[PDB]
Amino acid sequence: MVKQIESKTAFQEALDAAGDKLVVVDFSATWCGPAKMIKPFFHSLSEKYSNVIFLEVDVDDAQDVASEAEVKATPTFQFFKKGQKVGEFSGANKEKLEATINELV
């Protein structure tokens, strides 16, 4: 399902809830139209890979989570597994999410 992380504290809890399941994190800015506009593929895929947990993160309302990763640009997607970061990339490319998920699935 989809989980919105409004704080780094919840980010740690969500990583633990995913367990060994893949975990994608979107740092898109909700205030940025181009970034939020690309969320349908990220959010829509949640049911495409229900065996994968998708997290949505606001660099503005969830800046504590983004500051931890030192995000230098949005939208940025980060992959976590067992609470371990194994991949990250930037650029408004929704299809790229499909390949990276396939890569870490």
Partner: peptide, 13 residues
């Protein structure tokens, strides 16, 4: 220097 595909943090928000 500004790419529509990317949002810059230089933004006050």
């Amino acid at each position: 220097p500004a790419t529509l595909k990317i949002c810059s943090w230089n933004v006050d928000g």
